[PDB]
């Protein structure tokens, strides 16, 4: 069985209300990983057990170049621990914040890898439900790595629906802001918001008052910079179609609609998944313990059983 003191704990990469993420070295191999350490007390308090177990279980079987690979899942009497590959490039949120805006070309590159990942998940009857800049990270080479699978629902195929009011406020699709249920198209809306952010340098809707924000999502029309290309405008218009039945990727073909959109005219989708496309930005990390693409806010800081957890990549 795997335990806490099998690792050296080097730097805090992130901290939130659910828990914290830490750069760790595996003592037994000397290799570096990221560890997410959630407290059971908080999870049981917020009644997020199913979601937290879902996160492990989905990672235990998924394999894809642009999804974060889970090395270990294990636990203590009071903590839940995920050990995954350290994304040296950090979050897209970090980069977009620093650079303000990406070129349509650079956006097209990240978008294509996210579409690849979403096609994979949706083919596996899994809706991710939380596409955002915080959950899109970059590996040392500069490729997309989707992270945090704690709001995934399983058994959702074309037509199937979901009932949990969940996601991130600024990224919630308008149908999620209605009664009853919604479908897997919510993911394509999510892509739409991040694509809009990457090319327009802001969310399509924003207000710190959720009541005001949720009204904007349902009612307000999206605007575009004049300079934005017609195809770029068309993609965002399609991805951010308020009606999910007429949203790009919301039909039965799922990702094939998005893939066949003219914004990705230059993209070969088999080159995408085979990693044959060259990243426009390569993380300038000098060592393995380098945390330059993470915030000083975190890196400056010092440092009853859940079933269906306790997984290992060497064993399964």
């Amino acid at each position: 069985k795997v335990t806490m003191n099998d690792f050296d704990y080097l730097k805090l990469l992130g901290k939130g209300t659910f828990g914290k993420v830490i750069l760790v070295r595996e003592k037994a191999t000397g290799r570096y990983y990221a560890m997410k350490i959630l407290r059971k007390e908080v999870i049981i308090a917020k009644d997020e057990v199913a979601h937290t177990v879902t996160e492990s279980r989905v990672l235990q079987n998924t394999r894809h170049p642009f999804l974060t690979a889970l090395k270990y899942a294990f636990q203590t009497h009071d903590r839940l621990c995920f050990v995954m590959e350290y994304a040296n490039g950090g979050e897209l949120f970090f980069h977009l914040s620093r650079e303000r805006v990406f070129t349509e070309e650079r956006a097209r590159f990240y978008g294509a890898e996210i579409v690849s990942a979403l096609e994979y998940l949706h083919s596996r009857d899994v809706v991710y439900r939380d596409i955002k800049l915080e959950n899109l990270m970059l590996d040392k080479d500069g490729h997309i790595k989707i992270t945090d699978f704690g709001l995934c629902k399983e058994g959702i195929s074309d037509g199937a629906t979901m009932k949990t009011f969940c996601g991130t406020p600024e990224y919630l699709a308008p149908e999620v802001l209605e009664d009853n249920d919604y479908g897997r198209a919510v993911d394509w809306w999510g892509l739409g918001v991040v694509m809009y952010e990457m090319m327009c340098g802001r969310l399509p809707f924003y207000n710190q008052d959720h009541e005001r924000l949720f009204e904007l999502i349902l009612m307000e029309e999206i605007r575009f910079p004049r300079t934005l290309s017609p195809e770029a405008k068309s993609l965002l218009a399609g991805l951010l179609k308020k009606d999910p039945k007429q949203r790009l990727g919301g039909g039965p073909s799922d990702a094939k609609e998005v893939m066949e959109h003219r914004f990705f005219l230059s993209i070969n989708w088999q080159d995408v998944v085979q990693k044959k496309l060259l990243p426009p930005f390569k993380p300038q990390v000098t060592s393995e313990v380098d945390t330059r693409y993470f915030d000083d806010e975190f890196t400056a800081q010092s440092i009853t059983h859940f079933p269906q957890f306790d997984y290992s990549a060497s064993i399964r």
Binding site: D130, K132, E134, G150, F165, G167, T168, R202, Q208
Partner: peptide
Amino acid sequence: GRPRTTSFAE
């Protein structure tokens, strides 16, 4: 640069 968003459920 918008502020850090926080995911949620129910």
